[PDB]
C-alpha cells in the first residue's frame, strides 16, 4: 500500500522521532547519499538520531531561504517506491535535486537508498 | 524482458554505438550523475557522442588501475530495472558506488537516470 512511506515522512517531518524510527525493519537500512562516495549506511538504531539532525538543518536551510520538496512515490514492485525531491529557494529556482529509493517488506522499510545528482568542481 | 538492458549495455561497452542509441524511445533521455547538482539530460541525438566519451575515459580509468563493475537488473515493474554498480581498484577496493535507474516502455528506454554517491570536501 506504500502507507509505510507516507507515515515515515509524517513523523519525520514533524519531528515524531520515535514513530518514524519504527516504520523501518529491524533489519532495514537507510543510506545517505553521501558518506565519502559510498553511502553511509544507518541501521535502525541510528535512525532517530539521524532525522533529529536532518530537521535541525532543515530549520536552518529554511531560514537561509532554501527547503526541500517531495514528489508522490512512484511505486513500482508493490514493494518498491521511488520519491523524486529538489532543494530549491522560495522563488522556485531548483539547485539540488535526487531520489529516495524506498524498498518495502511486511508493511515496513527495508531500505531507503537516498541519491543526489552531484555539483562537481 | 529487459533484454534492452543487456543490449544497451553490451553494446555500449563495446563501442556499438548504433545499437546502443537504438535501445533509446525515440522520447528517452539519459541523465547523467552530475550536472551542476541538477543531472544532465540527454536525448536520444546526444546519446551517441556520450557512450564514445565515456568509453574513451572508461580507457583512460582502466590504465590508471579502476574501473566500473555492474550488477544484473533487479527488475520491480516489468517496466523498472535497478542496474547498481561500483567503481573500484584492481584489488577490488571500492572507491564509488551508484545505481542506475531504467524505465522501459514497448522494449526500449526511456529513461536511463544515473546516481552517484557524494564524495564530500
Ligand atoms: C543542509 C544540507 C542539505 C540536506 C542534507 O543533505 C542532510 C541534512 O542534514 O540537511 C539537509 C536536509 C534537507 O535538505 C531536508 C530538506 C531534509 C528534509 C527532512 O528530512 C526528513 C528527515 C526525511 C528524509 O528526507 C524529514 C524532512 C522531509
Ligand atoms: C573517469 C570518470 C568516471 C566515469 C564518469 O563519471 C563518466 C565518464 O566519462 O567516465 C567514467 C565512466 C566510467 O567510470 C565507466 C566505468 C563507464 C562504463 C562504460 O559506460 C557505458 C557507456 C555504459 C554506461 O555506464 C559502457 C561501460 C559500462
Chains 1, 2 share one sequence.
Not at 565519502?36 to 539532525?53: A, F, Y
Request: aromatic share 8%; charged share 30%; net charge negative.
Amino acid at each position: 500500500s506504500a502507507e509505510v512511506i507516507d507515515r515515515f515522512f509524517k513523523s519525520s517531518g514533524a519531528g515524531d522521532i520515535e514513530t518514524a524510527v519504527e516504520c523501518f525493519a529491524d533489519d532495514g537500512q537507510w543510506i545517505t547519499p553521501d558518506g565519502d562516495g559510498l553511502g553511509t549506511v544507518h541501521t535502525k538504531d541510528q535512525i532517530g538520531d539521524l532525522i533529529t539532525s536532518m530537521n535541525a538543518m532543515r530549520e536552518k536551510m529554511i531560514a537561509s531561504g532554501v527547503d526541500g520538496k517531495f514528489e508522490s512515490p512512484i511505486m513500482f514492485g508493490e514493494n518498491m517506491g521511488l520519491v523524486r525531491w529538489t532543494v530549491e529557494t522560495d522563488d522556485g529556482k531548483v539547485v539540488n535535486r535526487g531520489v529516495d529509493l524506498f524498498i518495502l517488506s511486511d508493511g515496513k522499510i527495508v531500505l531507503k537508498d537516498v541519491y543526489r545528482k552531484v555539483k562537481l568542481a
